[model samples]
Target: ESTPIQQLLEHFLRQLQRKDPHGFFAFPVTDAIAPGYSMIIKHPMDFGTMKDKIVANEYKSVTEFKADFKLMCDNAMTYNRPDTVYYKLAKKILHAGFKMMSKQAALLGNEDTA
Candidate 1:
């Protein structure tokens, strides 16, 4: 939280987490819950994983951070069949989260110009 981006992403993280109800995407996707999760999602990512990196100041850039968000959403859309509520929710949170973060890029100095 000492660094600028570190603190900025905190609120970004908080807002994104709230969009996903019931903690569905908050935690790791375990093997017990998803027997093929490991095999299927080779570069699997969870919101907690993203949060850990943000708090640790491990992220390289906001876009790098956004990559995980995209990865998370992509995984679900690929894993689950079309039109499932899983896929629906996946797009919903990703769109909402990315939209909020998109405009915030300007404030964080990433947007750079008008």
Candidate 2:
């Protein structure tokens, strides 16, 4: 059988692939730190905290980790409705921000970098 860490990594990669179709998602497997104003980690330090907690036996297995992670994702989706108006608005804002950043990078003539 695969180690717990390996199983966790696989689950993490699968969820990341769904969150980041371009496959650019970053660290911290505990939270949803991307694609929205959700609870996804904002820094490597946050990841460190999560890793420490996990290694300290806070989470018994990948199953427990997954359950908590899904709860965060569900909260990110919508407290009650999957297509809530607020959620749609937030998605639009995030998309606009990403597009603006992309445009700025292109304008700076560094499309190949960043």
Candidate 3:
């Protein structure tokens, strides 16, 4: 049986994979869980910078960024473990979160420009 921490980690990890795959180019947080056991990937670009760009109206259009986001989600789903139902649920939740985040970004961006 998986430990509670393992289950929690798996849950958050898969949700992130599904929702912000492109945002997280590599997993870095996994190392803290155990030596050689990290799973959170970090991207080349700083997420803080990306968020700043969004706030500054310097980021790309939603449609433009979303294409890559979808691809990232697809990649995660492809590699996801089939035996883990939790992983699958996380994917769906992530998709939902992505949709919401996209909308939120649009609203926030518009406010930033206005």
Name the best candidate (by lDDT).
Answer: 1
* Whole-model Cα lDDT of every candidate shown, in order: 0.83, 0.44, 0.45
lDDT of 2 at 9: 43
- Descending-TM-score candidate ranking: 1, 3, 2
Model 2 clash pairs are: 33-40
Expressed as tens digits, the lDDT of each residue in 1-114 for candidate 2 is 545765554545353335434322224433353344344333222223334445565766655654444443444345324476435543443455345434644676775664
Instruction: Kindly report which residue stretches of model 2 are placed more than 4 angstroms away from their true locations once superposed.
Output: 1-7, 10-52, 80-114
Candidate that would win on TM-score: 1
lDDT of 3 by residue, 1-114 (tens): 434434433343344445445534343223443343223332323233333344454534545344444444454454456565434654674478566655644675695654
- Work out the TM-score per prediction: 0.85, 0.32, 0.35
Candidate with the larger lDDT of 1 and 3: 1
- Which is the better candidate, 2 or 3, if ranked by lDDT? 3
Sliding window of 10 residues with minimal summed lDDT for model 2: 41-50
* Decreasing lDDT order of the candidates: 1, 3, 2
- Candidate 1, which segments miss by more than 4 Å at Cα? 106-114
In model 3, the clashing pairs are 26-41, 26-42, 27-40, 27-41, 28-40, 30-38, 30-39, 31-38
